């Protein structure tokens, strides 16, 4: 059932916005990255391109690829997507404007497909990290260890847990329109779309027309090449110009809700328990920085906290009634230290 | 938070006065002096009368529903227990009871009255923050007040509550060099910190 | 002479195991990475894929590429291998299951080729570093500097210095076998291979057969789709199920022995020697963290050690008889400081 | 006007030198990297390849690609250039031997195109950083913030602000010449070029000839395969052998002059001003390490400096007459703190 979210698919178009460091510098990429969310734990980021990949223009195959080239879409194959950061990421799934991808940490986020003639990427700043949930501060999820309640995004699309406003596009520039009528500047239209037109000189002042000419002005560089083409709504990017007329409809879901997955998760190597008189020597040797902590169960709590990444023999003045001990997200231990001094 | 920016207005020749919409922390500031490159170079034919009205409000993340700290004013209440007694020759009852010193619980055959205990130390403090499973006896500032960056920059009564308090110090700045975008200058949340500069 | 290690080539197959974070999550990649060895110095790691690239199935061209697709190999071209870490690595050479590649440091190791229809990579955790041998703690080998005895792996294959056990595979699952005989679950065989079969119900209990049917059970999901196909041995991966019958033969070499190459290696910029009365002021200015150290040649040694990465004017109370001075792996200097106080 | 620097184009050739870690090790790449300059601020490095890309051999299209293959050029398309560092860089522009590219920081620099049959890259060590100009120590240029006078290289070619000496090449080896005349070692010539020849034995001692034979010696490995082919000058690389004859002419410009561009540049988030009695508490919360500093305007200056990356509530004993306050390259503030103690 890839055919349950024609809310977005039929009605939304691949938006195009201003990528900030688009290979060279600020281009206008269709895959302009907004709303980077390195807020989960599972090595995953949910991203929004302004491009709406997924099904085609019409009806088929999530795994195809529709961005904007020109005023027009290009609903073709996804062949060579690349999200990346400090390292190349791993795609997880796309739906709508939105992609989920398993990334490592990275100061930035750097996205891009390959149309085939050109690289045509888009890149952005965003502070990314991946702490796993647990008192172990890994840099990456392992193959083993305990499972425990992480925060993470779904693989799936059949999703309604939230919805973001997606009303119309405003106009857009297209000076490919403003040709010349052999002495006058000549506007045309896409398909009968609504072209909003006048020039610095006095001539036609609104523009809701088929292909007009321009009686007064001559220069292409002093005219209103506009495309009110609101047959398909958009995401309400900050890098969108408002459609000044109205808040049109187009409430549209988000696929990648943050969910309470139990990540395959961390585990720190077991401790070396060593006895002394009402005292735990613990030669200790972790894999990664591990937050150890305890609770001397007297009404005097006297707890301790310390991230341990360097192997360290530590000590704990255990009392008569007991202490507990938390080697990372490994479960909490407990200890009777009554006498040992005879 | 999530600075879910509504898409700015761009009037091409002359001003567009903004109004203070009732969105939470609805930051909006008109801006002039642009020349917004949008797919065809610029599109507004003026050069200073090109106006850009940026607006941004604060909104609960999608994680707010699920990954969210949670404050409480905590009073004392009433303590409980699944007291087993493998009694006498009865040899069994595993019953849930109370502490208040007139409550019986006739589960099994015996009637048993417990407490009140003398050790009234509620390990919870008066004010508590709660997060998933890690509970913090934290003096959360309050609803309606939390300084931006500090804990509780976003303060929603519940998840459903459309109203909230968003002191995020959200300050829009003008977009650069005649290009469409929305500088939102903002403190990352006091929920972002409180997850890696927190207490135990 | 690429034709001197048919020990492995003829007799070993491209093993398939469970990659831990195979793009999405734990897949079963043929290039499943075990035994990462970032233990040398030369920017190099020796890796074992479970895949046996090298010659083809039969006899030709090390630079071809045989992994497992299905129960079957796919002995084709190596076209687009990618080992990588924090950055993309550089291949050095492959032989057998095993590849050598020049990598930078990286928290992880991340491997993958491109079959052509799919990326089909495999990734793993492993702490990697590259200290060069020397009192300079570079991050990378330079173009110049002194040569000195590093530890490093070879380019070559004509290698016997060690050999690892490589006995049979155990069985493997293949539920493509368990079709349906229009009401009964229908097993088949690869080529007459040995399929080990029964279902939860009572029917045929061993399975050493051609294509059988199943009288009793019906569901594919309650039957033993097994492939005892021990015509070619494997590497004894931890991610292998034991061939329960026996420790078959198949002792098989390792190509990439660690050898005593003299790496092109480090060198720290020369010091600025400055005289004082029985005292060396040394304004000093390295490229990278350099372990300086000395030996006051009296029977009182009074040595000193300090990694220097930040440029620092230091001091050394030289005695009458002498001191020596070790600016990184630059050779040790020596100094007469008799009087200078007249 | 790409036709204003035939100083270099007509008269200089794509030089070939010894790349230091050319994929495997020290090859001789035409794109051998000298003079890495990570000395500007704008994410940019100016590089010199020994290869002269730009126009072709003759006259057309900066965006084509002429390196040396053999003794010969190969003036073809630029299709798949890659400069890179810790991450892949972004090209800015090429002119002559020289390329400008927007890079991130990196311990090294790593360059390479793709001819099409081979990767054929070149790599080098060079300490790179990008501080933006400002009291903010970013790692990368943002989209917004104040503009202020950075140092940076141009996009353009119409450039004369400096010129580097570019006189002739010395000879080069080419043992493809020294064939065998069925018993004698046989030298040939490119196009009538000047081949400088003799062998360890006694035979022809200079060599300024067409295709000669060798009466005396026989082995290719004891002869002078040389190419005095000084019809086109070169860059005076350190990895060039001197043309022993003379300092020929060939003074040739540099395109990428460092210029006083105002980078789109940094800005740190505004402070939280808090009043106290003759004291500024300032809860502060930057994006990146920000150098804050002040000047108590008494003739007692009592200034302060501290890079702030961690958010910090600070304090400043303001005096009666005033203090000033510099939140990064955000403009300097000023403050009247007269009494507040009533």
Swiss-Prot record, chain B:
Glycans are attached at residue 84. It comes from the Viruses. Residues 34-51 are annotated as: E1 fusion peptide loop. It is found in: Virion membrane; Host cell membrane. Disulfide bonds join 12-44, 13-46, 18-28. It is a single-pass type I membrane protein. N-glycosylated. Class II viral fusion protein. Fusion activity is inactive as long as E1 is bound to E2 in mature virion. After virus attachment to target cell and endocytosis, acidification of the endosome would induce dissociation of E1/E2 heterodimer and concomitant trimerization of the E1 subunits. This E1 trimer is fusion active, and promotes release of viral nucleocapsid in cytoplasm after endosome and viral membrane fusion. Efficient fusion requires the presence of cholesterol and sphingolipid in the target membrane. The precursor of protein E3/E2 and E1 form a heterodimer shortly after synthesis. Processing of the precursor of protein E3/E2 into E2 and E3 results in a heterodimer of the spike glycoproteins E2 and E1. Spike at virion surface are constituted of three E2-E1 heterodimers. After target cell attachment and endocytosis, E1 change conformation to form homotrimers. Interacts with 6K protein. This is Spike glycoprotein E1. It comes from Eastern equine encephalitis virus (strain Florida 91-469) (EEEV). The chain holds residues 852 to 1051 of 1242 of the full protein.
């Amino acid at each position: 059932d890839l055919d349950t979210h024609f809310t977005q698919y039929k009605l939304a178009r691949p938006y195009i916005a201003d990528c900030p460091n688009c290979g060279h510098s600020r281009c206008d990429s269709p895959i302009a990255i907004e709303e980077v969310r390195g807020d989960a734990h599972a090595g995953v980021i949910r991203i929004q391109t302004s491009a709406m990949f997924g099904l085609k223009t019409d009806g088929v195959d999530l795994a195809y690829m529709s961005f904007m080239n020109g005023k027009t879409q290009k609903s073709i194959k996804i062949d060579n997507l690349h999200v990346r950061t400090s390292a190349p990421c791993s795609l997880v799934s796309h739906h709508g404007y939105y992609i989920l991808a398993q990334c490592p940490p990275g100061d930035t986020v750097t996205v891009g497909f390959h149309d085939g003639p050109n690289r045509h990427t888009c890149t952005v700043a965003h502070k990314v990290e991946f702490r796993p949930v647990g008192r172990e501060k890994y840099r990456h999820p392992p193959e083993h260890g305990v499972e425990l309640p992480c925060n993470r995004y779904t693989h799936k699309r059949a999703d309604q847990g939230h919805y973001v406003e997606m009303h119309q596009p405003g106009l857009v520039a297209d000076h490919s329109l403003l040709s010349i009528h052999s002495a006058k500047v000549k506007i045309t239209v896409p398909s009968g779309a609504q072209v909003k037109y006048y020039c610095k000189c006095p001539d036609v002042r609104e523009g809701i027309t088929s292909s007009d000419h321009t009686t007064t002005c001559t220069d292409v560089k002093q005219c209103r090449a506009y495309l009110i083409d609101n047959k398909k709504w958009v995401y309400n990017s900050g890098r969108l110009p408002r459609g000044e007329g109205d808040t049109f409809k187009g409430k549209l879901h988000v696929p990648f809700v943050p969910v309470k997955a139990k990540c395959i998760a961390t585990l720190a190597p077991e401790p070396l328990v060593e006895h002394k008189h009402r005292t735990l020597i613990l030669h200790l040797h972790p894999d990664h920085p591990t937050l150890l902590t305890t609770r001397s169960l007297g009404s005097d709590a006297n707890p301790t906290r310390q991230w341990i990444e360097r192997p360290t023999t530590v000590n704990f003045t255990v009392t008569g009634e007991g202490l507990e001990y938390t080697w990372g997200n490994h479960p909490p231990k407990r200890v009777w230290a009554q006498e040992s001094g005879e | 938070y999530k600075t879910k920016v509504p898409s700015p207005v761009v009037k091409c020749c002359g001003a567009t006065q903004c109004t203070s919409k009732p969105h939470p922390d609805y930051q909006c500031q008109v801006f002039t002096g642009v020349y917004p490159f949008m797919w065809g170079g610029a599109y507004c034919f003026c050069d200073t009368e090109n106006t850009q009205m940026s607006e941004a409000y604060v909104e609960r993340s999608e994680e707010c529903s699920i990954d969210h700290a949670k404050a409480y004013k905590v009073h004392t209440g009433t303590v409980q227990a699944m007291v087993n007694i493998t009694y006498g020759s009865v040899s069994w009852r595993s019953a849930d009871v109370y502490v208040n010193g007139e409550t019986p619980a006739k589960i099994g055959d015996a009637k048993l009255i417990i407490g009140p205990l003398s050790s009234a130390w509620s390990p919870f403090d008066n004010k508590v923050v709660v997060y998933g499973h890690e509970v913090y006896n934290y003096d959360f500032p309050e609803y309606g007040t939390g300084k931006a960056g500090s804990f509780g920059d976003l303060q929603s009564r519940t998840s459903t509550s459309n109203d909230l308090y968003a002191n995020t110090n959200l300050k829009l700045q003008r977009p650069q060099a005649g290009i469409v975008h929305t500088p939102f200058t903002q403190a990352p949340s006091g929920f972002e910190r409180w997850k890696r500069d927190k207490g135990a």
